[model samples]
Target chain A: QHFEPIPHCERVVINVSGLRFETQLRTLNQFPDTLLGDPARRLRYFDPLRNEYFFDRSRPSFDAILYYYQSGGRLRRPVNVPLDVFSEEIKFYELGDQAINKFREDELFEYPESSQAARVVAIISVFVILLSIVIFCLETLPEFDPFFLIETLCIIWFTFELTVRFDVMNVIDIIAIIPYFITLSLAILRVIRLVRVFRIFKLSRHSKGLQILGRTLKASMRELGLLIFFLFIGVVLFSSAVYFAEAGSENSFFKSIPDAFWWAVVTMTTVGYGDMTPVGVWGKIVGSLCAIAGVLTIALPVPVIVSNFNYFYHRE
Target chain B: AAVAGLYGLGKKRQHRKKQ
Candidate 1:
């Protein structure tokens, strides 16, 4: 395909409405359907008053249209420009039948931050992560060769999917695929493959439960911090008190304050393990107090988190 | 936004018909 240029000046001046654009003749003539390409049109025939080609269409989007020609077919709709106006300008230029369709597709499906596409991408990414985790678990079985082949195929497919949907890429999607390329050494593969367990975090993007949980934590951070601070003080106090109360006894499990930390943690969280027990009455009293403090601390931030979640999720 | 888009499309169709 070749363009037969009108024998005139090297540069063609396009006057779009009142806005003037100067470009090489070859640039505007690249698309045969456009104004400059038709040598027989009145634009090519010089007018007595105006010296250059003129288009009576709206000029606001002409810059973007000219840019499409100059930049080798890359068209970006200007941020503040109306889509209908842009579509009208594109049609006026006769860029092609598919230019509007292409623009619509890009606007609708390409960008991740665009709400509709983001939701679709997030759901697909979650499914990809869950399927990969299943394959990863299957690879840990005794007869694992077939499962390994399936895992490799799954990774390859996921890689292609990511490449195709590159505009929809998110942090968790990138993290989910990281373990695939790090399978160099067998021991390293086994260890780092566990990192794929973080793929479950990808679900937090789509699930309303996780979204509300995240908002709740963010809104209640100060109160949660206070709870944690009090819990820490309680643990230290009870561990030290239990140490002194039981360390002198013959059958004591509290060898030191540090040793009693494990018991303190378990007791304060009210998750008592029978492995450690204090023989003295004072130690038992401290343990009971720590358990009660744990309950109080745990209950402190519950109402705050619940209220924040309800406010954010159900607001008009 | 989608509703506005559909309305614009319908408007374009009507304008094209009138033309």
Candidate 2:
């Protein structure tokens, strides 16, 4: 029986500026009637000497062109090559004039030109933050209405804006909505209602400076934790020492450890009110040490935090 | 993201000119 052997798979090799690029026949055929596809085109002919079709083009960018063919028409401009040179190669390939424009657009991509819609949104966003602050201030006035109906509507608008923009529920956004309801239900806890002032932090979204500050604070969490831990230990140790040293005094301000804690807090922060004074020699020495410890502890984290702020502020 | 994209456009245009 006469059996014919299977034909070998069709493959094409492109020789670009003396560089050999091996590829399948199907790739060139994807864009039929183009320079590489049509048999009548000079590029479709195989060079017998080199055993590949030759093109005079940059070798580096040709890989990107082959990628566009191989991936079924996806063009990702290579970062290393100059865009205009690549544009010329793409034009020679006869990929499409449309693709050339798209590559041009990609190379020139920047912050989208601000549209009228975007401008209006930005203005309204700023206005909303200011209006929220005004509403908060108005709530504190003695002559203001206790119903807070206007405040409720403004808060509802905030909720709608948050929903439309984020399209995802954030815990902080949910927490921000609480004060509007809390002030109405529990009118007695005015002090607790003041927690709503934290919503002022929402301005971080609008202010670039605030965004940098937030990032710096986030990055310095460990240093802040260390500062707090040091403060706590210093307060406890100094409070106990002050209580013992002042106990022997006839007219002592440090009655208990709790009473001495107030003095310790004041001393460590270096906010000496002069309301409570150490009369004895040892008490004065202890107070001076406490003040020095406060300065050292507070000063330690300040430089680190300030440097982080500077770094983030300049990054934008 | 759109602003970032536009910035890339300007940056590349500048780069193309410089080259």
Candidate 3:
């Protein structure tokens, strides 16, 4: 511990069954309750004649427990020492449950994301997916007749990529490429090629936003059901009312309740239709009420659905 | 892609499955 002389007094020697180890006296100061740090236990393990302390224990496994006292509380499991043996040593030396179980922690904390490599891989995947989808969107732009060959390469890579990636792993994946063969069998290659555009659907699994949006829709399914039922009731109620009222007039636009369904929804939802508007006074009154009733029916549930969407969006 | 998207004429690719 010095350049001039290895002063032996402040340095304490410890022997694991016989081999011998030396550490400073104050080195064990921080963790006083541990066995090596206790005054009475330290003296019990002491060999006064040898000017050292001797404990009949495994030498290989004693370092970190000693290391545990010296600087930090990280009680490392020593090399070549079996897990069970090290665990026993830790318990024998008197350490806490967190200390005894802490050895399992170093690797347990590792994860795929929040690191450079993991995020960059996902970003590259997103880039390629959006690139293909871009091609799908643009080629329909009337002047952009290109990338049939490039898309061939892109689609081909997807085939190769999915297959090669499969060469690496489950159910969602089996539908991924296995559908290629199933769809290929009936010779709808154009349909198959076009369906490749729908590969964008598969892209959402890794994206948190879209997947959360998907989750929101599923959770908000009841609101949609409410809208559908209310829409259903309003249309049936109004369509029949309109049909009968106009029926009292000679030239009725609606032939029957069934025929008025087309006009009923058009009037309720405010679609611009040619003949759905009524001729007579009571019929127009029915139109006004139907339109307003439809608005209120569809309005309230959407705010619940919208709030539900925004609720879990950041809730994750 | 234009054949399915229709540009102005018909149902979109996603809409077909929706129907």
Candidate 4:
């Protein structure tokens, strides 16, 4: 229960009735059993059956004579001993100090000091990313005037964040940062970030419908050329038809052949706001036919276009 | 550049149309 100065080793003794239990400890000695090693021997010493007086003649330590008198036969093994059986068992320590709080270890296993800065940056970056996503989504509503301010702030903050990181961590170290590498390196990604950085326009509204109205436009170049030629022919014919038909009417819808062509396209595309309308009965019938044809025209080839390029090809 | 981005979008859409 107490430490006393001994000749070469720290001595500790236990007193019970008339019996004395003293342990003499020294530096862990080298072992001869090169194959099994120290941990295996220590583990075997803890075995209950081996602790008994066993007639194992070949092993000198496990023989009957030594088992009866030694403390190993009677003393309860300190199950909570701090000495690990596997790793770093070579570090010298006083036997009594092993069980006492004087040698208690302060944990340095995970190397916490080095990771703190990175951890903070990771947290801040995630918050900024989420905040930017929310702000941009909210900006779609026309009523919000100050949406551009938040967007501008996001751009500035993001650029500042990257700059700060580059200053703190070198080019190679910055590459190790996960979020930066993924968004920049990965291909086949579709997002505002990817498209904005890469520079790509997805689709337009008007050209999508025009490519469908003529069936020959769906085929080879010559056929498509013929289709366009005929479409122009039809436009001129229709314009002339409306021009002559509406010449006497108050409506200046078919003012000239060029004006009539514009009116015909507007009516044929079904974008007719009645800003240009036929006043005569025959011209009105022609406008009605163009409006009906425009419906079938716009709906065609849309499915083909969507099915093909829904996921754009991207190269990293 | 914003213009560059529009050009890229145009390329992407044209690439889509080819398919």
Of the candidates shown, which would achieve the greatest TM-score relative to the real structure?
A: 2
Please write out the lDDT profile of model 4 over residues A1-316, one tens digit for every residue: 3223234555433222223334333212221222112334434433364232122122221222122223222212222333353122222212233322332431122112227455565455556556655665665558663765665665566556546543212332233232334445335444434433310111111123332332223334554455456556656767787788777778466568787887777765566646443366888777776666544454443333333232222210
Q: Give the lowest summed-lDDT range of ten residues in model 3 chain A.
A: A1-10
Per model, how many backbone clashes are there?
A: 0, 12, 0, 4
Worst 10 residues of 2 chain A by lDDT: A107-116
Q: How is the predicted docking of candidate 4 categorized under the CAPRI scheme?
A: incorrect
What are the clashing pairs of model 4? A199-B8, A200-B8, A200-B9, A201-B9
**Chain B TM-score of model 2, please?**
0.21
User: Considering only chain A, what is the TM-score of each predicted structure?
Assistant: 0.54, 0.58, 0.50, 0.29
Q: Model 2: per-residue lDDT, tens digit, A1-316?
A: 2222232558878888788888777666666665766667844556888677888778888888877767756788766776578767777867777766776656311112236457566567568767777888877789864446666766887788666655112555566677677656455576557777766766665677987887888899988899899999999999888778878888887778887887888899978748544458777888889998888888776666766776667657
Instruction: Give per-residue CA lDDT, model 3, range A1-316, as digits (tens).
Output: 2112222437788899876888777666556676776776677887779888888988888887776766456555544666678777877867666665666654221122537556665666567667767877887689862576655555565565565554111233344444346544556766665665565765665667776777788898988899889999999999889888887777788789998787778777777457545468877888889888877786656766665566567567
Q: Model 4, stretches more than 4 Å misplaced?
A: A1-149, A157-237, A275-278, A306-316, B1-19
Deviation of model 1 at A14, angstroms = 58
User: How large is the interface RMSD of candidate 3?
Assistant: 18.3
Error of 3 at A134 (Å): 3.9
Q: Which stretches of candidate 3 lie over 4 Å from their true place?
A: A1-114, A118-120, A137-147, A160-197, A270-278, B1-19
TM-score, cand. 2: 0.55
DockQ for each numbered candidate: 0.02, 0.04, 0.01, 0.02
Q: Candidate 1 on A48-105: residue-level lDDT in tens?
A: 5867777778777777887777665677776547777887777765677676677776
Ranking by TM-score: 2, 1, 3, 4
Model 4, first chain, TM-score of: 0.29
